[PDB]
């Protein structure tokens, strides 16, 4: 539907693949371009990822207000670089209660506080796909100007050192350049 998005790796698309880092677990086959389509769905395509936009799961009102105060819009003119990061979390994560996951997410890991410092440099989108039976749980999307490449790379090193990332069992970085 309107909230469903598909990412198709192949020879066509609006984004050129700069590199793919297989951070953790099985990776994705290297391709020339990524085609992004609004909806569900590839002759010379190597892989296909899909997720949906959904409601807030963890952020509290005060956190949303801070985010909504500075987060930039998508498709900025200077935002020619983008990074697609599919992520999967362990079964131990999904069996835990809501309060247990909230505490790890922000209290122990400060996911929102840490990321909020890298705005408005980085725009972001979050898509869910575990409920669709996909091989990943989330598709995360970030786009920024080349100036913030080092800053974004620093954020990744920090996030991957948090308690939350002890439950990440698969992760891939797909670096993209807008055409």
Q: Which residues are annotated as a binding site for heme b?
A: 57-59, 89, 111
User: Which is it for the CA torsion 177, 50, 137, 71, positive or negative?
Assistant: positive
For ligand HEM, what does the binding mask look like between residues 79 and 108, x meaning CB under 6 A? ------x-x-x-------------------
d(CA 90, CA 111): 18
Residues 31, 36, 37, CA angle at the centre, nearest 5°?
135
Least distance (Å) between residue 101 CB and a copy of itself: 8
> Which of 52, 150, 54, 63 has its CA nearest to residue 105?
63
Q: How many helices (H) and strands (E) does the chain have?
A: 5, 8
| Interacting residue with a copy of itself among 133, 150, 157, 179 (CB under 8 A) | 133
31: partner contacted, choices ligand HEM, a copy of itself, none (Cβ within 5-8 A by kind): none
- The whole-angstrom separation of Cα 68 and Cα 84 is 22
- List contacts with a copy of itself (CB under 8 A): 1-4, 52, 54-61, 63-64, 94, 96-100, 102, 128, 130-133
- List contacts with ligand HEM (CB under 6 A): 56-59, 67, 85, 87, 89, 111-112, 115-116, 118-119, 122, 124, 126, 138, 140, 155-156, 159
């Amino acid at each position: 539907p309107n909230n469903r998005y598909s990412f198709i790796g192949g020879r066509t698309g609006q984004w050129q693949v700069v590199k793919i880092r297989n951070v953790l677990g099985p990776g994705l086959q290297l391709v020339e371009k990524v085609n992004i389509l609004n909806g569900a769905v590839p002759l010379d395509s190597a892989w296909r990822l899909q997720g949906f936009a959904s409601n807030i799961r963890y952020a509290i009102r005060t956190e949303l207000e801070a985010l909504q105060a500075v987060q930039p819009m998508l498709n900025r003119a200077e935002a020619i670089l983008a990074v697609l990061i599919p992520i999967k979390k362990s079964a131990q994560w999904w069996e835990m209660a809501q309060d247990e996951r909230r505490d790890i997410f922000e209290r122990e890991s400060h996911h929102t506080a840490v990321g909020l410092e890298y705005l408005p440099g980085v725009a972001r989108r979050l898509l869910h796909c575990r409920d669709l039976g996909e091989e990943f749980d989330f598709l995360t999307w970030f786009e920024f100007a080349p100036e913030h490449s080092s800053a974004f790379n620093e954020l990744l090193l920090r996030m991957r050192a948090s308690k939350e990332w002890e439950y990440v069992e698969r992760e891939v970085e797909v670096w993209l350049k807008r055409l």
